[PDB]
């Protein structure tokens, strides 16, 4: 149908906007702490602690398969990255602190992304 095509075009455009959001958020992680999944070879107890691991590569795979239907889904994954890290690592660690900084800096990007998603529809 023509309606299915129009819905598909909306999703493609949301994907484009979320790709630019993802890039902007990942630049706030210049240490690349959150770039890849926590290695289960290197942290073998991880899944005993963190039930839904997340990282930027995994989000990028979902994004490129158009697997985010709305901004809320995407934000959920971003918050996982932060929240996972702030539980596994203590306050006095470079990892915890990288998360706090990513959260605070990413808030600004996400606030305008929400306005753009609503505005453009």
């Amino acid at each position: 149908s023509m309606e299915q095509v129009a819905m598909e075009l909306r999703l493609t455009e949301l994907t484009r906007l979320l790709r630019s959001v993802l890039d902007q958020l990942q630049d706030k992680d210049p240490a690349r702490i959150f770039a890849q999944p926590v290695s289960l070879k290197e942290v073998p107890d991880y899944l005993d602690h963190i039930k839904h691991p997340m990282d930027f590569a995994t989000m990028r795979k979902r994004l490129e398969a158009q697997g985010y239907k709305n901004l809320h889904e995407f934000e959920e994954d971003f918050d996982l990255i932060i929240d996972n890290c702030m539980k596994y690592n203590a306050r006095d660690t470079v990892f915890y602190r990288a998360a706090v900084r990513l959260r605070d800096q990413g808030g600004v990007v996400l606030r305008q992304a929400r306005r753009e998603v609503d505005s453009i529809g």
Side-chain angles (χ1 to χ4, degrees), residues 1-2 4-6 8 11-15 17-40 42-60 62-68 70-110 112-119 121:
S1 74
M2 198 39 239
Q4 288 295 313
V5 166
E8 294 165 351
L11 178 62
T12 294
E13 287 305 295
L14 173 67
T15 303
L17 175 160
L18 295 184
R19 186 178 306 115
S20 168
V21 175
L22 184 64
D23 292 338
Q24 285 178 70
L25 291 172
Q26 184 152 28
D27 289 336
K28 310 313 183 157
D29 173 33
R32 301 194 67 86
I33 290 163
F34 308 108
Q36 292 293 328
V38 172
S39 169
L40 302 171
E42 301 171 358
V43 187
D45 73 357
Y46 196 63
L47 298 187
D48 293 341
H49 291 266
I50 298 305
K51 299 294 170 184
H52 296 100
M54 191 52 49
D55 70 273
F56 288 126
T58 298
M59 289 190 66
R60 196 172 293 280
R62 181 161 169 193
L63 181 64
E64 287 314 330
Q66 301 193 342
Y68 298 111
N70 55 55
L71 182 59
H72 181 72
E73 291 188 345
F74 176 99
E75 288 172 319
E76 285 202 327
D77 270 359
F78 179 69
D79 283 340
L80 274 174
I81 290 174
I82 302 314
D83 293 340
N84 287 346
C85 183
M86 295 176 69
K87 295 173 182 81
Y88 189 84
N89 304 105
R91 228 161 12 254
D92 72 327
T93 64
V94 64
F95 306 105
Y96 186 118
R97 291 164 172 279
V100 166
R101 288 162 67 81
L102 179 57
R103 193 196 59 188
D104 290 348
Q105 294 199 286
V108 180
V109 174
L110 289 168
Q112 196 53 43
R114 160 58 60 210
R115 296 193 62 88
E116 287 175 353
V117 166
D118 296 353
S119 191

